[PDB]
Scaffold this active site. Structure first.
Site, PDB file in Angstrom:
ATOM      1  N   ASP A  19       0.829  -1.209   0.000  1.00  0.00           N
ATOM      2  CA  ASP A  19       0.000   0.000   0.000  1.00  0.00           C
ATOM      3  C   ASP A  19       0.866   1.264   0.000  1.00  0.00           C
ATOM      4  O   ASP A  19       1.289   1.747   1.055  1.00  0.00           O
ATOM      5  CB  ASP A  19      -0.952  -0.038   1.185  1.00  0.00           C
ATOM      6  N   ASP A  46      -1.739   5.077  -5.690  1.00  0.00           N
ATOM      7  CA  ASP A  46      -2.068   4.240  -4.542  1.00  0.00           C
ATOM      8  C   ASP A  46      -2.294   2.791  -4.948  1.00  0.00           C
ATOM      9  O   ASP A  46      -3.351   2.448  -5.486  1.00  0.00           O
ATOM     10  CB  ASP A  46      -3.294   4.783  -3.830  1.00  0.00           C
TER      11      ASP A  46
HETATM   12  C1  LIG Z   1      -5.600  -1.685   2.113  1.00  0.00           C
HETATM   13  C2  LIG Z   1      -6.325  -0.351   2.230  1.00  0.00           C
HETATM   14  C3  LIG Z   1      -7.037  -0.363   3.540  1.00  0.00           C
HETATM   15  C4  LIG Z   1      -5.347   0.862   2.111  1.00  0.00           C
HETATM   16  C5  LIG Z   1      -6.031   2.251   1.820  1.00  0.00           C
HETATM   17  N1  LIG Z   1      -6.991   2.077   0.784  1.00  0.00           N
HETATM   18  C6  LIG Z   1      -8.311   2.437   0.872  1.00  0.00           C
HETATM   19  O1  LIG Z   1      -8.814   2.901   1.890  1.00  0.00           O
HETATM   20  C7  LIG Z   1      -9.090   2.130  -0.397  1.00  0.00           C
HETATM   21  N2  LIG Z   1      -9.633   0.816  -0.248  1.00  0.00           N
HETATM   22  C8  LIG Z   1      -9.661  -0.029  -1.331  1.00  0.00           C
HETATM   23  O2  LIG Z   1      -9.331   0.336  -2.456  1.00  0.00           O
HETATM   24  C9  LIG Z   1     -10.165  -1.442  -1.076  1.00  0.00           C
HETATM   25  C10 LIG Z   1      -8.866  -2.231  -0.866  1.00  0.00           C
HETATM   26  C11 LIG Z   1      -9.001  -3.666  -0.333  1.00  0.00           C
HETATM   27  O3  LIG Z   1      -9.978  -3.808   0.716  1.00  0.00           O
HETATM   28  N3  LIG Z   1      -9.558  -3.394   1.967  1.00  0.00           N
HETATM   29  C12 LIG Z   1      -8.938  -4.290   2.965  1.00  0.00           C
HETATM   30  N4  LIG Z   1      -8.768  -5.575   2.533  1.00  0.00           N
HETATM   31  N5  LIG Z   1      -8.556  -3.974   4.152  1.00  0.00           N
HETATM   32  N6  LIG Z   1     -10.822  -1.864  -2.230  1.00  0.00           N
HETATM   33  C13 LIG Z   1     -12.177  -1.758  -2.293  1.00  0.00           C
HETATM   34  O4  LIG Z   1     -12.791  -1.304  -1.343  1.00  0.00           O
HETATM   35  O5  LIG Z   1     -12.745  -2.188  -3.439  1.00  0.00           O
HETATM   36  C14 LIG Z   1     -14.176  -2.181  -3.497  1.00  0.00           C
HETATM   37  C15 LIG Z   1     -14.709  -3.383  -2.786  1.00  0.00           C
HETATM   38  C16 LIG Z   1     -13.834  -4.397  -2.359  1.00  0.00           C
HETATM   39  C17 LIG Z   1     -14.341  -5.502  -1.702  1.00  0.00           C
HETATM   40  C18 LIG Z   1     -15.723  -5.608  -1.466  1.00  0.00           C
HETATM   41  C19 LIG Z   1     -16.584  -4.613  -1.896  1.00  0.00           C
HETATM   42  C20 LIG Z   1     -16.084  -3.498  -2.556  1.00  0.00           C
HETATM   43  C21 LIG Z   1     -10.001   3.315  -0.983  1.00  0.00           C
HETATM   44  C22 LIG Z   1      -9.769   4.657  -0.366  1.00  0.00           C
HETATM   45  C23 LIG Z   1     -10.506   5.754  -1.166  1.00  0.00           C
HETATM   46  C24 LIG Z   1     -11.986   5.426  -1.444  1.00  0.00           C
HETATM   47  C25 LIG Z   1     -12.140   3.998  -1.935  1.00  0.00           C
HETATM   48  C26 LIG Z   1     -11.437   3.012  -0.991  1.00  0.00           C
HETATM   49  C27 LIG Z   1      -4.940   3.310   1.393  1.00  0.00           C
HETATM   50  O6  LIG Z   1      -4.356   2.963   0.188  1.00  0.00           O
HETATM   51  C28 LIG Z   1      -5.483   4.736   1.498  1.00  0.00           C
HETATM   52  C29 LIG Z   1      -5.606   5.166   2.934  1.00  0.00           C
HETATM   53  O7  LIG Z   1      -6.672   5.099   3.540  1.00  0.00           O
HETATM   54  N7  LIG Z   1      -4.489   5.616   3.661  1.00  0.00           N
HETATM   55  C30 LIG Z   1      -4.359   6.070   5.031  1.00  0.00           C
HETATM   56  C31 LIG Z   1      -3.852   7.539   5.152  1.00  0.00           C
HETATM   57  C32 LIG Z   1      -4.452   8.516   4.180  1.00  0.00           C
HETATM   58  C33 LIG Z   1      -5.442   9.415   4.588  1.00  0.00           C
HETATM   59  C34 LIG Z   1      -5.980  10.337   3.687  1.00  0.00           C
HETATM   60  C35 LIG Z   1      -5.544  10.369   2.367  1.00  0.00           C
HETATM   61  C36 LIG Z   1      -4.552   9.482   1.951  1.00  0.00           C
HETATM   62  C37 LIG Z   1      -4.007   8.566   2.847  1.00  0.00           C
END
Ligand SMILES: CC(C)C[C@H](NC(=O)[C@@H](NC(=O)[C@H](CCONC(=N)N)NC(=O)OCc1ccccc1)C1CCCCC1)[C@@H](O)CC(=O)NCCc1ccccc1
Ligand SMILES: *[C@@H]1O[C@H](CO)[C@@H](O[C@@H]2O[C@H](CO)[C@@H](O)[C@H](O)[C@H]2NC(C)=O)[C@H](O)[C@H]1NC(C)=O
Ligand SMILES: *[C@@H]1O[C@H](CO)[C@@H](O)[C@H](O)[C@H]1NC(C)=O
Length: 394
Positions: free
Chosen positions: A36, A237
């Site tokens: 990630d 990302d």
């Molecule tokens: C592994 C994951 C938890 C890492 C973070 N990703 C995310 O939060 C994203 N999640 C995704 O793409 C997820 C990734 C995998 O699922 N999560 C886990 N296995 N734990 N994909 C996902 O949700 O796909 C759709 C879906 C999947 C499964 C079932 C139904 C629908 C995004 C964020 C934006 C909106 C859509 C969802 C990361 O890359 C971004 C993050 O939250 N980072 C933390 C700090 C930060 C704060 C503010 C801005 C930037 C960074």
């Protein structure tokens, strides 16, 4: 140059992420971790967790590692401005998907071994999950490996520690995502992987510690669908399954992907309705109308039929005939985004992996990495892209 290479596993349709194995502790416990570039922590459940789901490996057992140290608070206080709760420095991480992971910090030996047996070791401060929720409860990966850079008085991240402890390597890592698995490269990128060789396309990062770039427009059939006067600042990302864009650009692209989505090729009415359209038929006119018909006729001719799944996500039976998209980078260079990237394999179809952003956070995700080398040039503050034949696992 010296390139250390590690195997990545995963896919878009079933895992929704890509992951690798690292060894933690002495004797080593093998822990699989989502790769990630959008987060900074390295974390996973630890034995004694009560609010954690079942993953590919059992929670990390701190008592079995001779070299682990729970980060207890001294004087009810913690390094790195962390908070003390119940005697331990608290780990607490929220993600944009809505998930909140929490627990406590500990340090132990991290060991990273390439499939050519080259090994970098160091100590890292890592999070123990004592609470998981949302997608974390049901995922198969045991934890998450944040790949972003350390901040001035913050917890030293995996990437910075890795390079501090391998001065034989240049400060560059590359992610090569294919449809199944891929490769992580420390030390540079592999030119052998490049298709044909095409030239690496370089863009400057726009923030010091996160991986952002400015996207100045997004074309389909020669036509810019992006309404942004200035740019969009987009997070690069690998922990985001899909690419996320403003609603207006989304609806324009979807307007023409629908025209190109034909659910029954033997309905001559519907096929004739589409082939009869002119530049004047569209809600939004196109500058390359001829290229739109070339794509439409190619889809009809090969019978590349389409099915719509949850939410009007189009899925085609073939890559053949779908258009290229073009991302306008700060150079004014227009980078090709092909169907084998932005479509993803779901069973026997190719499905569009482009979604609406939320919270005003545009994201270049795994459907932008796919079938590319994405090159994080840490020393020069740039990210590079080139088309590639990425390894597959399994
Ligand atoms: C592994 C994951 C938890 C890492 C973070 N990703 C995310 O939060 C994203 N999640 C995704 O793409 C997820 C990734 C995998 O699922 N999560 C886990 N296995 N734990 N994909 C996902 O949700 O796909 C759709 C879906 C999947 C499964 C079932 C139904 C629908 C995004 C964020 C934006 C909106 C859509 C969802 C990361 O890359 C971004 C993050 O939250 N980072 C933390 C700090 C930060 C704060 C503010 C801005 C930037 C960074
Ligand atoms: C599709 O229609 C648009 C709009 O009429 C065409 O673009 C315009 O072309 C005229 C010249 O005829 C210019 O003066 C306008 O400034 C253009 N507007 C826009 C928004 O581009 C476009 O060329 C047409 N495409 C084809 C293939 O004929
Ligand atoms: C990118 O960064 C380099 C290095 O500082 C700089 O010389 C160059 O002008 C930058 N280009 C753009 C388009 O920002």
């Amino acid at each position: 140059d010296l390139l250390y290479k590690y195997k990545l596993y995963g896919d878009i349709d079933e895992y929704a992420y890509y992951f690798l194995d690292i060894d933690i502790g002495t004797p080593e416990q093998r822990i699989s971790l989502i790769l990630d570039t959008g987060s900074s922590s390295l974390s996973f459940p630890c034995a004694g967790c009560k609010n954690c789901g079942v993953h590919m490996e059992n929670p990390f057992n701190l008592n079995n590692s001779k070299t682990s140290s729970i980060l207890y608070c001294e004087n009810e206080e913690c390094p790195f401005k962390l908070n003390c709760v119940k005697g331990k420095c608290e780990y607490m991480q929220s993600y944009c998907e809505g998930s909140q992971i929490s627990g406590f910090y500990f340090s132990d030996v991290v060991s990273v071994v390439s499939y050519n047996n080259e090994r970098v070791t160091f100590r890292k401060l890592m999070g123990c999950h004592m609470h998981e929720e949302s997608l974390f409860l049901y995922q198969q990966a045991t934890g998450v490996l944040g790949m972003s850079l350390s901040k001035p008085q913050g917890i030293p991240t995996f990437v910075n520690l890795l390079f501090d402890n391998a001065p034989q390597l240049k400060q560059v890592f590359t992610i090569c995502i294919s449809e199944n698995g891929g490769e992580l490269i420390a030390g540079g990128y592999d030119p052998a992987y490049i298709v044909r060789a095409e030239k690496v396309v370089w863009e400057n990062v726009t923030r010091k510690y996160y991986y952002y770039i400015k996207v100045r427009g997004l074309d389909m059939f020669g036509t810019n669908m992006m309404s942004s006067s200035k740019g969009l600042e987009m997070l690069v990302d690998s922990g985001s399954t899909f690419t996320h864009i403003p609603e207006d650009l989304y609806n324009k692209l979807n307007y023409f992907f629908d025209i190109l989505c034909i659910q029954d090729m033997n309905n001559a009415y519907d096929v004739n309705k589409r082939l009869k359209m002119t530049n004047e038929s569209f809600n939004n006119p196109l500058v390359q109308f001829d290229d739109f018909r070339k794509s439409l006729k190619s889809i009809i001719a090969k019978e590349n039929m389409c099915v719509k799944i949850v939410d009007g996500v189009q899925c085609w039976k073939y890559l053949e005939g779908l258009p290229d998209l073009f991302v306008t980078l700060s150079n004014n260079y227009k980078m090709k985004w092909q169907p084998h990237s932005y479509l993803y394999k779901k069973e026997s179809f190719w499905c569009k992996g482009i979604e609406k952003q939320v919270n005003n956070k545009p994201i270049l995700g795994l459907t932008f990495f796919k079938n590319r080398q994405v090159i994080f040039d840490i020393q020069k503050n740039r990210i590079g892209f080139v088309d590639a034949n990425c390894p597959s696992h399994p």
